Amino acid sequence: DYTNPPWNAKVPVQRAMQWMPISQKAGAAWGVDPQLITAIIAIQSGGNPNAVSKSNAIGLMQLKASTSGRDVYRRMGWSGEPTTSELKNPERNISMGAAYLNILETGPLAGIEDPKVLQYALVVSYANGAGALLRTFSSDRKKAISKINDLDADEFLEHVARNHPAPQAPRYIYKLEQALDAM
Ligand SMILES: CC(=O)N[C@@H]1[C@@H](O)[C@H](O[C@@H]2O[C@H](CO)[C@@H](O[C@@H]3O[C@H](CO)[C@@H](O[C@@H]4O[C@H](CO)[C@@H](O[C@@H]5O[C@H](CO)[C@@H](O)[C@H](O)[C@H]5NC(C)=O)[C@H](O)[C@H]4NC(C)=O)[C@H](O)[C@H]3NC(C)=O)[C@H](O)[C@H]2NC(C)=O)[C@@H](CO)O[C@H]1O
Ligand SMILES: [Cl-]
């Protein structure tokens, strides 16, 4: 079960919460819930702005320059990818994570009607990629979206746990709720 072992959110969220003024700024800029941002901070770095994963996901929202970093630079009208030092900077890190969430909402996940389903799809896509999420429904992006829209948030989570090739995928939703409950 993707909820084992249990995940206590109180501390990660407490530390995440220290970044709220930045998350508010980033969120307002990109049309993203600052609590959604904070929960992602808590789950991914536990609020450590200097954290670097074994796969080079960097900073508070654990962005990978070669994937999310590139997509955000593209969205800004820029070439290339952000540096590791830029991704360690709290403001630049949160602003880019917020931008990535908006990119996901407006691109691959466009059309998802239920706000809770969309929230869940955003976190799973953020963590394991929109392409991977969509492929658990269809090879056609918008048929995938049509299928997602047949589901409620609980069914959506069930489908992810049942079909997603990465076991961690539904665990991100479990921790998401843990974090939201601590806030
Ligand atoms: C150690 C610690 O402190 N914490 C760790 C924690 O880091 C670990 O989790 C890690 O989290 C990060 C996210 O925060 C994971 O990063 C994910 O990884 C995804 C899979 O590679 C990645 O998905 C890819 O995103 C690309 C860019 O959007 C997609 O390509 C794009 O597709 C578009 C069409 O949909 C296309 O138009 C674009 O042109 C194209 N862009 C580019 C540049 O190619 C790509 O399709 C997609 N992959 C798939 C399969 O769908 C996410 O972007 C990325 N998110 C971010 C925000 O960077 C990271 O992988 C996690 N690590 C691991 C090992 O899983 C965690 C362990 O899980 O442990 C904690 O302790
Ligand atoms: Cl996949």
Swiss-Prot record:
Q: Please give the name of this protein.
A: Endo-type membrane-bound lytic murein transglycosylase A
Q: Specify the domain of life of the species encoding this protein.
A: Bacteria
* GO biological processes: cell division; cell wall macromolecule catabolic process; cell wall organization; peptidoglycan metabolic process
Report the family membership.
Answer: Belongs to the transglycosylase Slt family.
Q: Which UniProt keywords apply?
A: Cell outer membrane, Cell wall biogenesis/degradation, Lipoprotein, Lyase, Membrane, Palmitate, Signal
Per the record, membrane topology reads: Lipid-anchor
- So what does this one do? Murein-degrading enzyme. May play a role in recycling of muropeptides during cell elongation and/or cell division. Preferentially cleaves at a distance of more than two disaccharide units from the ends of the glycan chain. Prefers cross-linked murein in vivo.
Return the broad EC class: lyase
Q: Which gene encodes it?
A: emtA
Q: Name one GO molecular function term.
A: lytic endotransglycosylase activity
Describe the processing and modification events after translation: The N-terminus is blocked.
